Design an enzyme around this catalytic site. Structure first.
Site, PDB file in Angstrom:
ATOM      1  CG  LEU G  40      -1.726  -1.562   0.988  1.00  0.00           C
ATOM      2  CD1 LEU G  40      -2.604  -1.203   3.172  1.00  0.00           C
ATOM      3  CD2 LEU G  40      -2.949  -1.385   0.407  1.00  0.00           C
ATOM      4  CG  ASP G  41      -0.484   4.971  -2.255  1.00  0.00           C
ATOM      5  OD1 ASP G  41      -0.961   5.053  -3.303  1.00  0.00           O
ATOM      6  OD2 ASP G  41      -1.562   4.199  -1.166  1.00  0.00           O
ATOM      7  CB  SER G  42       1.124   7.973   1.582  1.00  0.00           C
ATOM      8  OG  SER G  42       1.917   8.113   0.838  1.00  0.00           O
ATOM      9  CG  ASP G  44      -3.669   2.351  -0.421  1.00  0.00           C
ATOM     10  OD1 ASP G  44      -4.405   3.482  -0.528  1.00  0.00           O
ATOM     11  OD2 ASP G  44      -3.225   1.916  -1.047  1.00  0.00           O
ATOM     12  CD  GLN G  45      -0.575   5.168   7.928  1.00  0.00           C
ATOM     13  OE1 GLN G  45      -0.853   6.396   7.460  1.00  0.00           O
ATOM     14  NE2 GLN G  45      -0.865   4.655   8.687  1.00  0.00           N
TER      15      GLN G  45
END
Ligand SMILES: CCCCCCCCCCCCCCCCCC(=O)OC[C@H](COP(=O)([O-])OCC(O)COP(=O)([O-])OC[C@@H](COC(=O)CCCCCCCCCCCCCCCCC)OC(=O)CCCCCCCCCCCCCCCCC)OC(=O)CCCCCCCCCCCCCCCCC
Ligand SMILES: CCCCCCCCCCCCCCCCCC(=O)OC[C@H](COP(=O)([O-])OCC[N+](C)(C)C)OC(=O)CCCCCCCCCCCCCCCCC
Ligand SMILES: CCCCCCCCCCCCCCCCCC(=O)OC[C@H](COP(=O)(O)OCCN)OC(=O)CCCCCCCCCCCCCCCCC
Ligand SMILES: CCCCCCCCCCCCO[C@@H]1O[C@H](CO)[C@@H](O[C@H]2O[C@H](CO)[C@@H](O)[C@H](O)[C@H]2O)[C@H](O)[C@H]1O
Ligand SMILES: CCCCCCCCCCCCO[C@@H]1O[C@H](CO)[C@@H](O[C@H]2O[C@H](CO)[C@@H](O)[C@H](O)[C@H]2O)[C@H](O)[C@H]1O
Ligand SMILES: CCCCCCCCCCCCO[C@@H]1O[C@H](CO)[C@@H](O[C@H]2O[C@H](CO)[C@@H](O)[C@H](O)[C@H]2O)[C@H](O)[C@H]1O
Ligand SMILES: CCCCCCCCCCCCO[C@@H]1O[C@H](CO)[C@@H](O[C@H]2O[C@H](CO)[C@@H](O)[C@H](O)[C@H]2O)[C@H](O)[C@H]1O
Lengths: 172, 459, 171, 52, 98, 63, 86, 19, 60
Positions: G40-42, G44-45
């Site tokens: 995941l990427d920023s 999605d976090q």
């Protein structure tokens, strides 16, 4: 602002979604628009011109200010929420137990025996904690508020008492 | 009055010959008995005052002040014995001697039938008060506070002495009873204008009148608790009592000479109340509160109506007990955190729950909650001042709004909110401290059941 | 009764007899009977016992009568001995006249409650007597000031008398 | 009487002494005893001073 | 710089006397000083003083004035005289100027 | 805080209860004076012009 | 409200993650880094934190949120705020 | 905080030839 | 201590006697002078307040 560009975009994203959720109310409606909003962020995710990216962010902030909910939802215990600080009047500091009358301390013989052990542990650890900070702080004083972990075994992390012993969030 | 003067003097041998550890017990025990016997002064009649002898008399105006004065001596000993606990023994006895000599002068001041006798005793209170402030004050600025107090008072008293001696020369007497029957009207002339100013400006300074009030916040901030209790409770009332007696012989000139001083009091009360909203020092806030409350008394005395004198009488007693209580409450905090900054120690209701009840009760009386005598006195002045001129209701009404704002703000700032994290020496309230506040608030509230005994001679 | 009805008059009480037109029992009737038995009887028995203790010890107190003395109009100027007695006498009259205005105001207030919705027509004498008494009191004492006295009272009267003399001389 | 508790009579005695001095001073002020126009009266069979 | 005692650390009466009433460091004096304050202050002055004030005899003849006022109202209404006449002093005893 | 309020009640009730009982007995067993006309040629004592026995006693003793 | 437990918090934290379509409910474990392991990427976090906020009914500030990178860290954060010691 | 008393700097206000 | 008290009282007694005498002398002189000069101390014809006029100042 102390925040990097990467941090600024993320805070806007979270802020934008929350105000969008206030407008929509209904979860199915919110889901539909939340995905459209995520698409707008995903469109320029790979922009590499930091003058264009900075422009894109500033325009986005202006759009959020025009479209923000005048009365956004706030979690009850968040700043501004209806339960914020509701319990501060029940949080009593632990040092108040020192002033208890002997007859008051006699009703909890076992709690006040454990309490003494923690006070002993605090007294014995303090000098090492002070020393650890002195020999790790760069000349001139600290540059950040970050504190170190304990290194040796049997050492407690410096400046721990008021964090470990703080009142519970539901003290009564 | 010798049934009170002699016992009061006997407090001096009692203190000096008491065993070392018993000075506070003996003086407090016997000063309370004197306060008990002071209730015999309430043999008042509808028409005649209580005239004991050629030197002293008591009427319905001096009796409540006399009972307030003698009640205060035992309360000041309770308030004093803590911060003096490390004092040298002899210097403890001298401190108590100064308080006893102050009561002695005060009870004679309020009963003197001769105005020049009143003046000498009126002016004699300076010596013990000045000594208390400058010797037992805790800060550098206690020396300047002493001089301001001294020279503000003498600046007005010396003109007063000349005017009184002039009046005895042309009238033949300064006996107050005689002046009631031999008084003659004062006609318009520059000579009589300055006779009017001399007769009044000494009392205006002690009230204090707004404009001449700046000595009062200085003295309070620097005085010890006992000096603040007597100064607020009784010494301010000397001006009011003097004005209620001297205005008899200033008519009808008071009709137009009052105007500048009513304007200063009507506007001054609004500004001093507003200043209380931005005070950072707790003792200084209570001092500016007295200036606001005493401005009502000046207006009431100057308009000279039956309702205004009843109101002014009630205000002086009620404010005396309330202001003394507030100072003692702020002292109890100061003895812990050793600072007068109002914002320093917050959220105290959490740590001192019963002391937070005393704070609430004291604040409610300060804002004059019905039916407290604080309201009764304040209301009567408003009713009569409205008759004097309807427009004053606006200034009177505004002052009640501001008075509520800073009274509860002082309650909210120190008692509510979160407690200050680093202040960890807030020990539980002592029995001495709780008893001290109950001795202010209980008599104050009891007088609501029978307020006629604090409504003065025009009741 | 226990006060003088002449000073505090009350018109005779006319209460209509019950004329129920309902088969139901009146709740108030039963509550009256219960109140009489439960509350009135034990309260009366305690009182009668107390009034028996009082009877065995009967002592008296009196209403002080003040002899009249020369008024301030008969005092030589600056004669304190005669002025003082006229001043004490004037103050007692002043305090008595305040109470006469309170008696009349009490009659007026009692009338307004007693008559009910008809008070405007049925309380005309009490209103008239209050208006006349307040006029006299105002003429005597109003505007004297906090430091009032028989001297100031007299000076106010003389000014009023001179004005009324000019009223008659003018017509 | 005890050397511990003899100082506790200084102020109670002061009250009695002051009370007595107050009564004596009233003797110097009897010029009008039973002579005021408001209160003068004939004397009872055994009375000798209307007040004292 | 110059010879001087350092300020002594503030003391807590509860430290060596958990029963302290705050009056004195001596427990025997501390209890005595409490008793004289509570007894004389509350039992005597406030309780007896309040009872004394409650039963003061007709303070400033407020009851007498009402009783007298009743007597005059009864008299003047029976004899047809005004309840209260505006002239406070008998005008026959006055001599207006001019 | 609890200790102070128990002491406050005790010393208030220390004389309060005796006073309340005494006042009740005075009212019940002694009672109040009865208003009477002054007998011809009788000169009442100044304390006989009051109704309640406690008021009369205060006037007789202290005033 | 009924009290929480460490195992109860962990059960619900994963429960929410198992209903997210960008995460493989089989690869998921309390120690999976949302970035390194789950891909995941920023962005999605951020949404994961919002989902946990909605789950437990309280806000996690952005200053604290960005550091929660594995499910165990989220579990530890919630327990600290709710005074859960089980 | 114990009672303030004059220090050397204060006292020397009164040690000159004139005030 | 007894000599301090005795000496003060001794001196005070004579001072009080002279003090009293000088005030008796002042009265003796004043009264005889009033006797010697009747024209300068004439009896005032004393009106009563019924006859005298005083302007009334309302306290409104
Ligand atoms: C606090 C400060 C205290 C100051 C000192 C006290 C001084 C004092 O005692 O004077 C009090 C006064 C005593 O006056 P007093 O001059 O001695 O009476 C003279 C009579 O002749 C008394 O003669 P008496 O014979 O009629 O009275 C004797 C009486 C008992 O009377 C007493 O002894 C009362 C003693 C009270 C002690 C003080 C407490 O005998 C009984 O036992 C009656 C029993 C009836 C039940 C059956 O008595 C009281 O007022 C006590 C309270 C009375 C009852 C209250 C009235 C009922 C409430 C209705 C109005 C309120 C409405 C509700 C509003 C609520 C708010 C929303
Ligand atoms: C119930 C709802 C809550 C209402 C409040 C509860 C209390 C009311 C119930 C009590 C009713 C009884 C009652 O009040 O009547 C008795 C009376 C009031 O009613 P009363 O005036 O009609 O008296 C009744 C008795 N007779 C009939 C004889 C008159 O109470 C008092 O008068 C007490 C006076 C107290 C004031 C004196 C204080 C002591 C003096 C100490 C001096 C030092 C203090 C500082 C000095 C300050 C300057 C003076
Ligand atoms: C600094 C002070 C030094 C500066 C000089 C001070 C004096 C200047 C002010 C003059 C005061 C008024 C005055 O002097 O009037 C004198 C007047 C003389 O009149 P007389 O002859 O006695 O009677 C018959 C009249 N043809 O006297 C009279 O008739 C009556 C006099 C009564 C007493 C007057 C006392 C003077 C008061 C002046 C100060 C008033 C202001 C006080 C301010 C206080 C500030 C806190
Ligand atoms: C308004 C009606 C009555 C007014 C009476 C006014 C008379 C003067 C009374 C005060 C006399 C005080 O005399 C002296 O004044 C000055 C300031 O005022 C004080 O001195 C203080 O203020 C001055 C300047 O403001 C500073 O330079 C000095 O550092 C400071 O200590 C002295 O410490 C005090 O001894
Ligand atoms: C705190 C400050 C308070 C300030 C208060 C200011 C009040 C001002 C009062 C003004 C009244 C002074 O008194 C007034 O002046 C003189 C007295 O010399 C009187 O008049 C007398 O002197 C004037 C001189 O000009 C002559 O014209 C006149 O023939 C003579 O009778 C007035 O009839 C009197 O009414
Ligand atoms: C009508 C007026 C009435 C006035 C009443 C005033 C009451 C004042 C009460 C103070 C009571 C003090 O009485 C006290 O008695 C004991 C023995 O007798 C004395 O002696 C005591 O000294 C110490 C206390 O310091 C004790 O530990 C010791 O056991 C005892 O010998 C005290 O020195 C004295 O202080
Ligand atoms: C309980 C606390 C109360 C406060 C403290 C007050 C203590 C004193 C209270 C009551 C004192 C007794 O009060 C006194 O009683 C007697 C009754 O015998 C009255 O005396 C009256 O009745 C008796 C007969 O019964 C006769 O002597 C006579 O007819 C008359 O003098 C007094 O007029 C009254 O003043």
């Amino acid at each position: 602002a102390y925040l990097t560009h990467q941090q600024k975009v993320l805070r806007l994203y979270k802020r934008a979604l929350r105000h969008l959720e206030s407008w929509c109310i209904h979860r199915d409606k919110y889901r539909y628009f939340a995905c459209l909003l995520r698409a707008r962020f995903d469109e320029h995710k790979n922009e590499k011109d930091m003058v264009k990216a900075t422009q894109l962010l500033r325009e986005a902030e202006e759009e959020f200010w025009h479209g923000q909910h005048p009365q956004p939802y706030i979690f009850p215990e968040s700043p501004g929420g209806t339960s914020y600080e509701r319990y501060e009047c029940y949080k009593v500091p632990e040092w108040c137990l020192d002033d208890w009358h002997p007859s008051e301390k006699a009703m909890y013989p076992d709690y006040f025996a454990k309490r003494e052990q923690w006070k002993k542990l605090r007294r014995e650890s303090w000098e090492r904690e002070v020393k650890q900070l002195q020999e790790e702080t760069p000349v001139g004083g600290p540059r950040t508020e970050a504190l170190p972990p304990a290194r040796k075994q049997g050492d407690l992390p410096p400046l721990w008492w008021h964090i470990v012993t703080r009142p519970r969030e539901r003290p009564m | 009055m010798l049934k009170y003067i002699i016992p009061t003097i006997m407090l001096m041998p009692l203190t000096w010959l008491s065993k070392n550890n018993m000075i506070w017990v003996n003086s407090t025990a016997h000063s309370l008995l004197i306060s008990f016997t002071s209730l015999l002064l309430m043999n008042q009649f509808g028409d005649n005052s209580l005239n004991f002898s050629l030197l002293f008399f008591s009427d319905s105006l001096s009796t409540p002040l006399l009972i307030l004065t003698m009640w205060l001596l035992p309360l000041m000993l309770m308030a004093s014995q803590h911060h003096l606990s490390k004092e040298n023994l002899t210097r403890k006895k001298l401190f108590i001697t100064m308080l006893i000599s102050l009561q002695l002068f005060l009870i004679m001041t309020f009963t003197a039938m001769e105005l020049i006798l009143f003046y000498i005793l009126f002016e004699a209170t300076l010596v013990p008060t000045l000594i208390i402030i400058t010797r037992w004050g805790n800060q550098t600025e206690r020396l300047n506070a002493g001089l301001y107090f001294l020279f503000y008072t003498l600046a007005g008293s010396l003109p007063l002495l000349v005017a009184l001696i002039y009046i005895q020369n042309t009238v033949g007497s300064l006996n107050f009873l005689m002046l009631q029957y031999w008084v003659q009207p004062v006609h318009n002339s520059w000579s009589n204008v300055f006779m009017w100013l001399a007769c009044m400006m000494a009392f205006m300074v002690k009230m204090p009148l707004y404009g001449l009030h700046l000595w009062l916040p200085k003295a309070h901030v620097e005085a010890p608790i006992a000096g603040s209790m007597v100064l607020a409770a009784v010494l301010l009332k000397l001006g009011g009592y003097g004005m209620l007696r001297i205005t008899l012989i200033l008519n009808p000139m008071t009709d137009f000479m009052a105007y500048p001083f009513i304007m200063l009091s009507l506007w001054g009360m609004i500004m001093t109340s507003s200043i209380c909203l931005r005070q950072t020092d707790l003792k200084s806030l209570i001092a500016y509160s007295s200036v606001s409350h005493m401005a009502l008394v000046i207006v009431a005395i100057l308009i000279q109506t039956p309702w205004s004198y009843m109101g002014a009488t009630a205000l002086m007693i009620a404010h005396g007990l309330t202001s003394s209580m507030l100072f003692c409450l702020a002292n109890s905090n100061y003895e812990r955190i050793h600072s007068r900054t109002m914002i320093l120690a917050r959220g105290l209701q959490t740590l001192l729950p019963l002391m937070a009840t005393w704070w609430l009760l004291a604040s409610l009386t300060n804002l004059a909650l019905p039916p407290t005598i604080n309201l009764i006195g304040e209301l009567f002045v408003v009713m009569s001042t409205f008759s004097w001129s309807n427009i004053t209701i606006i200034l009177m009404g505004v002052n009640m709004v501001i008075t509520a704002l800073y009274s509860l703000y002082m309650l909210i700032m120190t008692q509510r909110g979160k407690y200050t994290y680093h202040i960890n020496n807030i020990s539980p309230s002592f029995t001495r401290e709780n008893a001290l506040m109950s001795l202010h608030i209980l008599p104050l509230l009891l007088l609501t059941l029978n307020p006629k005994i604090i409504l003065g001679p025009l009741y | 009764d226990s006060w003088d009805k002449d000073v505090y008059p009350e018109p005779p009480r006319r209460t209509p007899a019950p004329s129920p037109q309902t088969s139901l029992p009146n709740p108030i009737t039963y509550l009256t009977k219960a109140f009489d038995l439960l509350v009135d009887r034990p309260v009366t028995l305690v009182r009668e016992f107390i009034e028996r203790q009082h009877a065995k010890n009967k002592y008296y107190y009196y209403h002080r009568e003040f002899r009249r003395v020369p008024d301030i109009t008969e005092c030589q100027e600056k004669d304190v001995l005669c002025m003082f007695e006229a001043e004490m006498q004037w103050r007692r009259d002043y305090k008595v006249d305040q109470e006469i205005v309170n008696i009349i105001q009490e009659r007026l207030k009692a009338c307004q409650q007693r008559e009910g919705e008809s008070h405007r027509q049925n309380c005309a004498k009490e209103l008239e007597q209050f208006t006349q008494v307040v006029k006299a009191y105002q003429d005597r004492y109003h505007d004297l000031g906090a430091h009032y006295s028989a001297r100031k009272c007299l000076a106010k009267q003389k000014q009023r008398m001179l004005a009324e003399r000019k009223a008659a001389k003018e017509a | 009487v005890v050397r511990d508790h003899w100082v506790h009579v200084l102020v109670p005695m002061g009250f009695v002494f002051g009370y007595y001095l107050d009564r004596k001073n009233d003797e110097k002020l009897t010029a009008f005893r039973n002579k005021s126009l408001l209160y003068k009266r004939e004397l009872k069979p055994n009375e000798e001073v209307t007040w004292k | 710089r110059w010879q001087e005692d350092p300020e002594p650390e503030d003391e807590n009466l509860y430290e060596k006397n958990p029963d302290s009433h705050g009056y004195d460091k001596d427990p025997a004096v501390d209890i005595w000083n409490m008793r004289v304050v509570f007894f004389f202050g509350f039992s005597i002055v406030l309780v007896l003083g309040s009872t004394f004030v409650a039963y003061l005899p007709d303070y400033r003849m407020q009851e007498w004035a009402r009783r007298e006022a009743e007597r005059l109202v009864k008299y003047r209404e029976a004899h047809g005289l005004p309840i209260m006449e505006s002239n406070c002093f008998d005008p026959s005893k006055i001599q207006l100027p001019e | 805080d609890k200790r102070f309020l128990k002491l406050l009640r005790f010393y208030i009730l220390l004389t309060g209860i005796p006073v309340a009982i005494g006042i009740t007995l005075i009212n019940v067993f002694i009672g109040e004076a009865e208003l009477a006309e002054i007998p011809e040629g009788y000169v009442p004592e100044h304390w006989e012009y009051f109704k309640h026995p406690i008021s009369r006693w205060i006037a007789r003793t202290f005033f | 409200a009924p009290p929480l437990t460490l195992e109860g918090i962990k059960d619900r934290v994963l429960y929410v993650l198992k209903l997210y379509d960008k995460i493989d409910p089989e690869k998921l474990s309390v120690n999976s880094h949302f970035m390194k392991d789950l891909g995941l990427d920023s962005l999605d976090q951020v949404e994961i934190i919002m989902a946990m906020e909605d789950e437990f009914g309280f806000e996690i500030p952005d200053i604290d949120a960005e550091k929660l990178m594995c499910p165990q860290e989220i579990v530890d954060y919630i327990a600290d705020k709710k005074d859960v010691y089980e | 905080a114990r009672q303030w008393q004059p220090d050397v700097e204060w006292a020397e206000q009164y040690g000159g030839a004139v005030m | 201590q007894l000599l301090y008290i005795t000496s003060f009282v001794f001196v005070g007694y004579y001072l009080l006697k002279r003090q009293d005498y000088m005030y008796a002398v002042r009265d003796h002189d004043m009264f005889s002078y009033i006797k010697s000069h009747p024209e300068d101390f004439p009896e005032k014809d004393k009106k009563t307040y019924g006859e005298v006029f005083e302007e009334f100042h309302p306290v409104r």
